Amino acid sequence: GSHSMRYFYTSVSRPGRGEPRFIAVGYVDDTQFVRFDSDAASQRMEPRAPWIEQEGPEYWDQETRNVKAQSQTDRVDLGTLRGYYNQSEDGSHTIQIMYGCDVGPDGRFLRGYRQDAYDGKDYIALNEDLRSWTAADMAAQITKRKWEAAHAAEQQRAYLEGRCVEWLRRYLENGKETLQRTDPPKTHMTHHPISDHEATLRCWALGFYPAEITLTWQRDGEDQTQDTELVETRPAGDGTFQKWAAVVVPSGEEQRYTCHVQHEGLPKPLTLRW
């Protein structure tokens, strides 16, 4: 279905000596494909997926120079925001920036996004119209007026509707064998006695891609949320995801309980019973 390209930037000030720690990561849907880490020896944007490795030397040289320019902007902005909020030189502060585009299954632009945080709270965001900004406080209000004067929204909108979608389309083609492939969950159920009268039923989903999934329990064909535990979806580390849903039941009654699995990779929802 729909696809996304997102970039995440984190800049952390280092009050004792030196530039801030800067980390940039690029994702296509749930797959990381590039990274820049200021603490790494290379000082280059690096490939994190095999399908991006085929990009030429000038792609890497430009990506390296462009992401380094963002780290310098972040360095200057950490100093600027410290002034806006009247903070001391002794503290560590954080700026986070996220932006990206969504394309339809065919390849055309759906939506764009851009938002910035300071010290883990909203600072400034580009609105849904991609033409105006939302400033969370008076410090972000100063930035908004600088950006309105400088036509910052217009440059972000142009990237999001232009280069962003053009490059996401190229990436989707280059990595089609893996990016356009859905891996359905591999499911199983386990049983864990708590006492001689109660037991936990655990329903597992392993090796799925994309990360989006729904695990739900039913007792005699009705939705059960009481005595349930669902862990957050977690990376397997190989590109796939995992999740489990558990329910505490009276021993002898486990046949009343059914686990329901919904995932893009399943042509029809799946049911598991003990």
């Binding site: 970039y7 940039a24 690029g26 944007m45 792609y59 430009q62 990506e63 462009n66 992401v67 320019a69 963002q70 902007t73 200057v76 902005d77 600027t80 925001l81 920036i97 932006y99 910035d116 600072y123 400034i124 930035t143 600088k146 950006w147 400088a150 910052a152 440059q155 972000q156 990237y159 280069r163 962003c164 490059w167």
Partner: peptide, 10 residues
């Protein structure tokens, strides 16, 4: 690909 010039100064 990233923004060529990056975000605008805050």
């Amino acid at each position: 690909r990233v923004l060529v010039n990056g975000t605008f100064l805050k």
